[model samples]
Target: VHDLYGFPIQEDERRSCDVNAEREVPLWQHYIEKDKLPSNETKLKEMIRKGVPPTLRNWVWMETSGANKKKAGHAANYYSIMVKAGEESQYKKDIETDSTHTFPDHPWLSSPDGRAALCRVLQAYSVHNERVGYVRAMNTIVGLMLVALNRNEEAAFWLLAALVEDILYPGTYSRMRALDELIGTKLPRLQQHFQAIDFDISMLATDWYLCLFSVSLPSETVMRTWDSLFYEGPKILFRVALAMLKIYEDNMLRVGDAGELLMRMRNAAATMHQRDVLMATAFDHIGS
Candidate 1:
């Protein structure tokens, strides 16, 4: 089977992916009832402010039907519609510009609504993580999360925070000093290893540190990799990066050119589209 990327689709063994969009609403409603969150907008935000339990992740995911098949496109559409519907014309204009460049390779992102989702999420993230201000990498990660969670902004926020706090690379959002410290301290081994294989370690480094590999890898593979990272800690990123290089070392050596090296990296990442191998590596024992 082929994924949206036209790579071999891997069987998502975690069984977490369900295309049934309608399923999330009822499930989320059940969670709303169980948690007794306030029904109205004012109360809901109030309850969340009081520190809503993170367990609502599944409920929110279910409510948004992020994994659903039917309305997945609709979810993206929802965000786009909201942006266009907004009174802020400047933001609306920004969406027109930003959507074109962000995830240009992904077809869904080009749609008006897809771009809308990108704008709303970034705006919200700018509000949410104001300390970090607006960073470039967030758009890619949020775009991917937006695809899965549909329109559940709350779910998207929680998941994004979880990733930024836990699954992030060493120097992604911190001050320049923190980034430098991470590269100086932790990147050496990984860098040396990639050099040993003739892959331009620096080229791979931006995606690694900046976006947590979200933009670098295929959605299916990145999703599964996220499953493990969510359950485990961030270290799985290192192992997975190593696995990609190790698996594709020969191809990199043979290419022996910078552009070809990048192409090979994309090719190796595409290899994760093989559903069976993705499932095996993602679910069975990724550390191997």
Candidate 2:
């Protein structure tokens, strides 16, 4: 049931993740094969919430992200030009070492090829989004894009553009504030448990917000969340955090010790590939 999609996984590189991409590919087949979704907006979001099909994630993600629009001038030379630009503005060598820092375990990114690809895009983003000084987490975010977009590095760059630069680069601290509101109010019962135990929720939530669920959640789960995130907007981030806890709400509440509860929560998050239910709960019930 491991369906990874990073081009060629040379076995050793594949050791990184227990990914699954197929069973849902079946759902994508009958679902209207358009890259743009003006015909059935709700249906597109519905499918987006249900987990965008693996193969189509490329086309659909680019179109929905609105990130693609940024590249209208040279979309033809997206990654190619970015790498050239990255080389021109060149921090030039530091990215070589840190490139290996991202997704070193996952199949493609673990390999030399994957590492090089991520480096190029990040370097391009380095020059492109210099206002934020290029975040470390961008490595993980672009790494996911490289995989989901299937190495369409141009698309990946734009995705990174839409996500970090165009979307919410200046808005994370405020995002944490919103995270508290949703987590506190949306699921007060589970929210109360953390308060009763005096659990430092902000620390954990920052990881989710900052990393966009890539560090804590499984890659597939993160990818699925990104599907909606790009399509809808960043607000889904709070919904996603709320939904992750929401799905596992009762389990954490029932656990005995705070330490014990953490392990249970961590364990649950590790193996979570329930994209259907995760996104289902995310949009339908876990909204602001």
Candidate 3:
């Protein structure tokens, strides 16, 4: 089989699954009726690993990440933060600039509504979390959440908060100091490979982690990575980064200099548009 990108598909490459509403509806129903989360942690993980059905992805992400809990009873607090955020937040200009760059070619993201939502989430977070404030590439993460949650602004806010504050290492979105440890410890082999070519792995890894691959990979691949990330935690970022390197290692090695190597790595995701192949490579190898 070949994907839309015309890449030859491996036998194990995953195709989209049919939504089993019969099985899924009850899980969601239980959550709604009981105001409780899915009790079967293993099943939830299995479903997410396979892929959450589109119809239920929003609820699944919110529930699994506990974004709902963060948002609950905070309606007044969210607006209050927005009001306090005002026009005076030091990061507002940067946030505006970053919003324009997010998914610039996409019609929805380029629109005013999309830009406004992105602004709201970042501004609120800047005020709500005083320590981190705003950071570059934060808009990209918030933009993805806004899209994934169907532009539910409140959910996007809480999800972004959960992601930066809890899901990722502290200071990851700020100065990104944690990336040094990730490259040195979690991906020592990959780091060595890049260093041999005079390519600093951080050049690529910064975008991969800061934007959660939204800036590098195709949208489908980004969402799939997120599905696993929500379940598996931050290690998936390292896995995916290593997987991208492994998939394009030959091409990367052929580059003549640091500039060419960085260019190749940046454009690599566009070349490998097969989401399943990229993800399969990530899951099957890399820290296994």
Candidate 4:
């Protein structure tokens, strides 16, 4: 169970977690058999908050990524089962028939089965959530999730749920119009706060919103910023955006060109490695 992916799945641990002490059992199944449903939403949240077992984590990542793993002759049967179940259908043969040279950068995506896995998830999700259809931004998000979760369809559905119900607007993600509204309306207040600190925010609005704050921040820092946004709603994006501009107020005013300003911002993200500090400050002042 301690093999990076924790659980009672190992054969040696079977007796300790056995139902009759004479038979083996998986931890998840054992938990279910004992009628141990998460008592409340908080408990359920805590389970995920504590982090999922690596196998589960990998399973979740795969379904979301749409990696296109079919052509390598692996997961072909699984693909067929999904297709038969009306879960998906593939249209592109390039992933299967094309040479590895096509996308050598992504080894997982180059293989036939790998590419198929990616396609299956995307197709199933497109069928599942018709309103959102297919957006290009989803690919990178899904791709990253796939790297974490080994199961494609499961990850896809989860990602879809997160985007539609949690943070992103289903139909409003295209052309970044929804993001534009966030910047136009609520961003100004945050900008004013930055101006109070002698930083001009008029020029940095697009940079922050368009990059999803990833371009100028560490992944952990960006994730923490997103924590507030998801919990408190989209307004937190504005608050953090303003906070970021304010952080560089002294240097931003002296910059002559927007390109140079962007370069400075990138340099700043590299310098401020305190993700915990960002999270603490953001949570302290921002409503959630």
Residue-pair clashes per candidate, as listed? 10, 2, 0, 35
lDDT of 1 by residue, 104-199 (tens): 655566567777666766665454444654566777777777665554554565566556644565446766333333333444544454455565
After superposition, the stretches of candidate 2 with alpha carbons farther than 4 Å from their true spots are 6-36, 75-81, 88-94, 99-101, 169-175, 254-263, 286-288
Worst 10 residues of 3 by lDDT: 4-13
Report how far off residue 52 is in candidate 4 (Å). 9.9
TM-score of each: 0.58, 0.81, 0.79, 0.49
Whichever of 3 and 4 has more lDDT, that candidate is 3
Ranking by TM-score: 2, 3, 1, 4
Ranking by lDDT: 2, 3, 1, 4
What residue runs in model 1 are displaced by over 4 Å at the alpha carbon?
Answer: 1-96, 105-108, 166-171, 175-199, 275-288
Per-residue lDDT of model 3, residues 42-75, tens digit only: 8767656655555555877887776777778477
Model 3 bad stretches (over 4 Å): 1-38, 73-77, 80-84, 176-193, 285-288
Model 2: per-residue lDDT, tens digit, 1-288?
A: 344553211232223222334544655675545434546788777667766766778777877877768789555766676578788654557667667565656766888888878888878877776665456666677777887887877778887777775566565423267766777778788778888876656656677777788767767667888888888888888877777888888898886567777777777876666665677677665344
Worst 10 contiguous positions by lDDT, candidate 1: 45-54
Candidate 4 Cα errors over 4 Å, as ranges:
1-116, 150-153, 175-217, 225-233, 266-273, 286-288
- Would you give me the overall lDDT of model 4? 0.45
Highest-TM-score candidate = 2
lDDT of every model, 2 decimals = 0.52, 0.70, 0.70, 0.45
RMSD of every candidate to native, in Å, equals 10.4, 5.2, 5.2, 11.5
- Write out the backbone clash pairs for model 3: none
Candidate 4: Cα lDDT at 3: 17
